[PDB]
Design a binder for these strands. Structure first.
Ligand SMILES: [K+]
Ligand SMILES: [Mg+2]
Ligand SMILES: [Mg+2]
Ligand SMILES: [Mg+2]
Ligand SMILES: [Mg+2]
Ligand SMILES: [Mg+2]
Ligand SMILES: [Mg+2]
Ligand SMILES: [Mg+2]
Ligand SMILES: [Mg+2]
Ligand SMILES: [Mg+2]
Ligand SMILES: [Mg+2]
Ligand SMILES: [Mg+2]
Ligand SMILES: [Mg+2]
Ligand SMILES: [Mg+2]
Ligand SMILES: [Mg+2]
Ligand SMILES: [Mg+2]
Ligand SMILES: [Mg+2]
Ligand SMILES: [Mg+2]
Ligand SMILES: [Mg+2]
Ligand SMILES: [Mg+2]
Ligand SMILES: [Mg+2]
Ligand SMILES: [Mg+2]
Ligand SMILES: [Mg+2]
Ligand SMILES: [Mg+2]
Ligand SMILES: [Mg+2]
Ligand code: NA
Ligand code: NA
Ligand code: NA
Ligand code: NA
Ligand code: NA
Lengths: 399, 151, 180, 220
RNA sequence: CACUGACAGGGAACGUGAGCUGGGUUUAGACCGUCGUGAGACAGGUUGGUUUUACCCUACUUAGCUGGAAAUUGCGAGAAAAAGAUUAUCCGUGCAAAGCGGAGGCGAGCGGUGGGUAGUACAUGGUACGCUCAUCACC
RNA sequence: UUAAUGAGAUUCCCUCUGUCCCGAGUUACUAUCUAGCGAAACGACAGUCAAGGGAACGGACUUGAAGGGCUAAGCGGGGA
RNA sequence: GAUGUGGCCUGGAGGUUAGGACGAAGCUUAUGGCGUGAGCCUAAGAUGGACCGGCCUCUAGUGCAGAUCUUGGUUGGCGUAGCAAAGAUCUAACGGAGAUAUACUCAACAUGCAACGUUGGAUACUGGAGCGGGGAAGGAUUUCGUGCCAACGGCACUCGUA
RNA sequence: AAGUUUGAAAAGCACUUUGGAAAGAGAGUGAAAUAGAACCUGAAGUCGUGACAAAGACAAUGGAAGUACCUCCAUUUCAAC
């Protein structure tokens, strides 16, 4: 008979436990349409940092129609992935079972370190017997039989892809063992999927071959961790009055007399953050090329200044974006340096917002350390001019 | 004098200490871990516990103690580094080694075969509580006996 | 280390042989790639040659693309028992947000740990000058940097270090040096 | 999946490939409760039973009556912690296993042994297809148990409407199984016909007194 | 009084005090009115008046280690596996077809790892590729 | 009835503010982990639930439903 | 609730019969046998060290599971709660058993840790209504020197109002 | 509160060995050091240790009937029996 308000938190994200993995993993793939061409559905990226952009909006009826807006964006570095294997799945009354794996003839050191805790001091025998066997005629026959089994019984075909940390030449991402994920091949018949996958073997796949610029994607990633947290932060319950004996930041009543136990719907202290999330409908604002190929990464048709996607001073705690990258509108779960998965969208992409063609007019590259007011180092140089240390440097130059 | 006997007494060395004045539970844990070890292996383990690179596994006297990664080699999660029990047991092992040397045995071959830690008679102190109450403050010393045999 | 890499299990000879085998494998890869990249770059055109940036170790102020930096390190050998070096320690990076009444004792412990890791010594003695310098602005006013003189000596063989203050007017431009 | 010790010991023993005495029941068009009762009593008698085609069990009444029964059962759940609550299984073979389990002393070791002697499948999986002639339970068949004017439900349809998601998989697999089995049966028709004609001619080749003996006991 | 789509009604030991708070109620102090000879009374008013303990079990929340299908044992053998001299005595394909196509040793084949050399490809230090000498295996 | 006085009871106004909207960030000391030291309260036996009956609100009983063992930090639903 | 019992049991007494250093009482038991049972009796002590059993009768402070029972001891909780006001110590040398304490390999780190008293130096606090210097009351050797660290100084001690 | 009640005699453990010491390991005395000093006997309860039995989660205990394994127990039988 009391005053009413909704409960705190979403019981569908239970338990608030630490995620089993640090990598974002797709728990489902888009519905497979056999009418389309065979195509990959996912890609692993690394979060570098955030900035903001200006664009004009194409949305008739809106008060911002034909008007500039500024959008925060997230930059995710996407070095190409390497396809090392093919797996097939057959459907049974108890769910999908993998038929087998067709391994590539050659694997990178980075892929093989994933099988070790201490690679440098190990014997480094991973895949050696497999190489010596598959190379022969009995091995060729076994591979042919596995491929024929894929053709005969598989309804689902996925590729085994791994990341290239040597190409992701990042100093703070300490890991050197490649990240491995199964990427599902959608489109076409099963034979067509197998042909695409077999062509992909031992090859590099670039993020622009999986995703196009103005499309949207879903992001699988794990959120930033906070360790043990109380109910106020973890659940959003109210703080108690100042007058409260023995503590304020808690739930006053954790239950009625009956049931004579505590329900699972009551907010408790515990792990907060480090949870897996799937975060659909992130618009791709840009798929950039690596700076060693195209250094004018942040240049647009309206801002002719030559600049890269890296802000002055670098991304804080991350460094330089050296590879291909993806500009996503808004935010994604997880901190910088964390590997994440971009998945082709599962929700229907027919709204005006999701179909809108994105054209960037300005990309902010000012310092992310302390109220950056210069877009480029040349702008700062022309503000300040000759400083004392530059004069000393020239004085040394003349002698 | 000991609850058990060596299989061969000419190839064994004994040592015991009574009313040790270490904590009985900690000494129980510290002495039990070396029960079937070679003497040198046990002495190295104690030296490394003093250096806190290895730990004493705490089984049965571990109610609400901390978890540590050094307890994994013993198949446990809970362990500690009880320096006082450790140094007392090092002294006891030195005495056992001396007894072995006197008997003409090689300490490099002796295997600890028997370790028993018991609760000795308790010493009484008192502590002062709220509302004028006096409440006990006891010390729990221990007896330790061991023998080792040539492999 | 693992059993197959333990010094007391393989012995000197086998440990050396396995080490040289790994090195010669890495070296064979490095030389093959060196020759291949040199000739592939040579027989390429100017548009492509400039398109390729510093692949074949062409660009200045770069690492050697062939191998690791530590593999290029010349291993002079055994350091002598008695050795002396002068080094700056960035104390403020270690003492940031530390409880004010603990700053100077913490600085002493951090200096001991720093030197002990540098010299493989657990007996690290603080000379009166260094303790006086660390404490000379009270407990919470430890200087952000200190230049210390480290003298290892011997007296099995027992190694210990004597750490003393080096008064400096400025810390700019000072790196780690060996003193005789 | 046997341990390496089991395989090594079998290799040492020189024993052959063994299979326990197992009865395979085809539950198509069987009354759910009556088949469950018969199977439970036989399991308490030590029999090893595999039941196939649990998706074609029947319950008396319209499908909606029995789907509503299932939904009533589904809402039973431990409110304070639904994990550890009643676990509601949607697959038809799971439903049959639960029905049999409720007809057993499941909280004794004897009842547990009996329940672990039962294997339930939807359709007829390939590991069962060739193990021998399957059996029916005459006292639990729909065509003698239900007056045919009454509506009845097929278990698989109800299950798929209450959450079972493998209906189409089992349907396609059963179609493939029947097609393969019918091809294998149309072939070998010549072998069966050859054996029939062989027996017919054996009659004219055997001694006559034996033929008369067969005649008086109804075999010739 | 006002906002709103609406400001519905109930239960949970009149849910919920080792969750709080303590305004009311309900001790001892004190004032009033009425009652009582009085001490005192009031179901009347008024003001002031200690809110104790969890480290046990369970529940719940997170967080580690770890056995186990005869739910620790039996050696007690059941695959949502294949399909054959009883799974042995080859590999592919094909419908569980009809058939069809490959399959004492030296040498050869096929490959794994090292030398020489030669383009090229891929995101461009690091792998693959053609030719030859070496070894290694399996045949 | 009363100026003055009041750690007396009450109402309103100005100022002011984390009292509140609605919470957030930082510190010391704890908790926490370690070394040394080391109690008490309490303790029939013990501890997963639903319903049912029952001294009319069961941890034990009837019928169902759960339940692999051992642990660290918390927490105040129950242990009437 | 009443009553019966050549019914059981315990400490003493009058009788009568025995036993014990070749081992009494007591105590221990997967230690059997007997009795419906209270209990009795044997065996074995790798227990003990000097008294004591049976039977008839007499006699009484004569039988325990519980009384918020009495006294002593033990015990889970538990290596738990905690030992958080009064800001604080650092460094070298000396002293000390208190160490630089090691199986093989091993140069030293990764295998003796943690803690002491004194002197010197550094740093800080008390801040004269003082952890200053003297008295009453109260206490009565706590004063001083040397020695010594079993117990005590809720951690420690080589130190101490021990 | 508290029997000094070791043992017939103190014969009260020389001497060796390692430990700073307390003590330990040996050796001696004694009929016996589980007679080693506030020491005869040395119970229950609780605890340590070795060997074994096993054992999910039915709190444990308990009844009744078997069975597996053990049994420092009893009794009987062992040939014209
Ligand atoms: K502690
Ligand atoms: Mg973090
Ligand atoms: Mg309060
Ligand atoms: Mg605690
Ligand atoms: Mg007190
Ligand atoms: Mg008092
Ligand atoms: Mg639901
Ligand atoms: Mg209260
Ligand atoms: Mg309160
Ligand atoms: Mg008051
Ligand atoms: Mg007043
Ligand atoms: Mg007043
Ligand atoms: Mg607030
Ligand atoms: Mg706590
Ligand atoms: Mg209930
Ligand atoms: Mg109860
Ligand atoms: Mg509670
Ligand atoms: Mg009666
Ligand atoms: Mg008497
Ligand atoms: Mg009496
Ligand atoms: Mg009674
Ligand atoms: Mg504590
Ligand atoms: Mg001062
Ligand atoms: Mg004073
Ligand atoms: Mg003390
Ligand atoms: Na009156
Ligand atoms: Na707990
Ligand atoms: Na009694
Ligand atoms: Na503390
Ligand atoms: Na004698």
């Amino acid at each position: 008979c009391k005053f009413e308000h909704p409960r705190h938190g979403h019981l569908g994200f239970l338990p608030r436990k630490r995620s089993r993995q640090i990598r974002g993993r797709a728990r489902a793939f888009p519905k497979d349409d056999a009418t389309q061409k065979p195509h990959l559905t996912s890609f692993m990226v690394f979060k570098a940092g955030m900035t903001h952009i200006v664009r004009d909006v194409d949305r008739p009826g809106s008060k911002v129609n034909k008007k500039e807006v500024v959008e925060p964006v997230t930059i995710l570095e996407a070095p190409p992935m390497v396809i090392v294997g093919i797996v097939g799945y057959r459907q049974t009354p108890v769910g999908l079972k993998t038929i087998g794996t067709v391994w590539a003839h050659h694997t990178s050191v980075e892929f093989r370190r994933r099988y070790y805790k201490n690679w440098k001091q190990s014997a480094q025998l991973a895949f050696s017997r497999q190489k010596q066997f598959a190379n022969t005629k009995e091995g060729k026959v076994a591979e042919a039989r596995t491929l024929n089994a894929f053709a005969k019984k598989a309804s689902v075909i996925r590729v085994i892809a791994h990341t290239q940390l040597r190409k992701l030449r990042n100093h703070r991402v300490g890991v050197k063992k490649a990240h491995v994920q199964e990427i599902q091949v959608n489109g076409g018949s099963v034979a067509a999927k197998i042909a695409l996958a077999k062509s992909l073997l031992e090859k590099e796949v670039r993020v622009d071959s999986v995703f196009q610029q103005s499309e949207a994607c879903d992001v699988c990633s794990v959120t930033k961790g906070h360790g043990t947290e109380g109910v106020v932060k973890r659940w959003g319950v109210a703080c108690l009055p100042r007058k409260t004996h023995r503590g304020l930041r808690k739930v006053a009543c954790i239950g009625a007399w009956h049931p004579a136990r505590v329900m699972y719907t009551v907010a408790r202290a515990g792990q907060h953050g480090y949870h897996h999330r799937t975060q659909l409908n992130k618009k791709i604002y840009q798929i950039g090329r690596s700076v060693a190929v195209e250094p004018n990464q942040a240049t647009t048709t309206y801002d002719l200044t030559a600049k890269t996607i890296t802000p002055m001073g670098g991304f804080v705690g991350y460094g330089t974006v050296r590879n291909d990258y993806v500009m996503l509108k808004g935010s994604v779960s997880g901190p910088r340096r964390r590997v994440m998965t971009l998945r082709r969208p599962m929700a229907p992409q027919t709204s005006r917002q999701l179909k809108e063609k994105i054209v960037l007019k300005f990309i902010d590259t000012s310092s992310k350390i302390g109220h950056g007011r210069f877009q480029t180092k040349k702008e700062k140089n022309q503000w300040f001019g000759p400083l004392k240390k530059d004069r000393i440097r020239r004085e040394e130059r003349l002698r | 004098h000991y609850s058990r006997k060596p299989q061969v007494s000419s190839k064994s060395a004994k040592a015991k200490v009574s009313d040790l004045r270490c904590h009985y539970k900690n000494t129980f844990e510290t002495a039990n871990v070396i029960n079937g070890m070679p003497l040198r292996k046990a002495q190295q383990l104690y030296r490394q516990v003093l250096a806190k690179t290895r730990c004493i596994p705490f089984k049965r006297y571990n109610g609400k103690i901390g978890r540590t990664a050094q307890a994994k080699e013993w198949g446990q999660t809970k362990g500690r580094w009880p320096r006082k029990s450790v140094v007392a047991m090092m002294s006891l092992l030195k005495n056992a080694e001396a007894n072995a040397i006197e008997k003409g045995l090689d300490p490099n071959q002796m295997v600890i075969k028997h370790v028993q830690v018991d609760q000795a008679a308790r010493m009484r102190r008192r502590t002062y509580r709220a509302h004028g109450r006096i409440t006990p403050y006891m010390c729990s010393p221990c007896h330790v006996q061991l023998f080792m045999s040539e492999k | 280390t693992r059993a197959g890499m333990k010094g007391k299990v393989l012995g000197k000879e086998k440990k050396a042989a396995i080490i040289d085998a790994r090195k010669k494998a890495a070296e064979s890869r490095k030389n093959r790639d060196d020759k291949r990249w040199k000739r592939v770059l040579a027989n390429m055109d100017e548009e492509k040659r400039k398109k390729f940036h510093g692949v074949g170790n062409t660009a200045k102020n770069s690492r050697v693309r062939g191998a690791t930096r530590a593999s290029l390190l010349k291993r002079t050998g055994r350091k002598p028992d008695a050795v002396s070096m002068e080094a700056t320690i960035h104390l403020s990076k270690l003492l940031k947000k530390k409880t004010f009444s603990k700053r100077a004792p913490l600085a002493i412990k951090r200096i001991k740990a720093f030197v002990g890791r540098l010299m493989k010594t657990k007996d690290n003695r603080i000379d009166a000058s260094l303790n006086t310098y660390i404490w000379h602005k009270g407990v919470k006013g430890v200087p952000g940097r200190v230049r210390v003189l480290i003298q290892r000596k011997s007296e099995h063989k027992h190694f210990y270090t004597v750490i003393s203050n080096v008064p400096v007017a400025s810390f700019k431009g000072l790196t780690t040096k060996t003193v005789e | 999946f046997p341990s390496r010790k089991d395989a090594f010991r079998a290799q040492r023993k020189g024993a052959k490939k063994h299979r326990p005495e197992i009865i395979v029941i085809d539950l198509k068009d069987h009354v759910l409760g009556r088949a469950a009762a018969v199977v439970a009593k036989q399991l308490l008698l030590g029999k090893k039973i595999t039941v196939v085609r649990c998706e074609q069990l029947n319950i008396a009444g319209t499908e909606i009556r029995n789907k509503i029964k299932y939904l009533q059962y589904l809402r039973k759940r431990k409110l304070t912690n639904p994990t550890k609550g009643p676990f509601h299984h949607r697959a038809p073979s799971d439903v049959f296993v639960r029905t049999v389990r409720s007809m057993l002393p499941r909280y004794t070791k004897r009842g547990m042994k009996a329940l672990n002697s039962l294997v339930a499948y939807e359709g007829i999986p390939p590991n069962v297809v060739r193990t021998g002639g399957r059996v029916v339970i005459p006292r639990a068949q729909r065509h003698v148990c239900y007056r045919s004017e009454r509506p009845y439900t097929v278990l698989g349809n109800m299950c798929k409407h209450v959450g079972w998601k493998y209906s189409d998989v089992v349907a396609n697999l059963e179609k493939a199984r029947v097609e393969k089995a019918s091809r294998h049966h149309e072939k070998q028709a010549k072998l069966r016909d050859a054996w029939k004609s062989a027996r017919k001619e054996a009659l004219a080749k055997m001694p006559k007194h034996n033929v008369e003996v067969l005649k008086k006991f109804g075999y010739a």
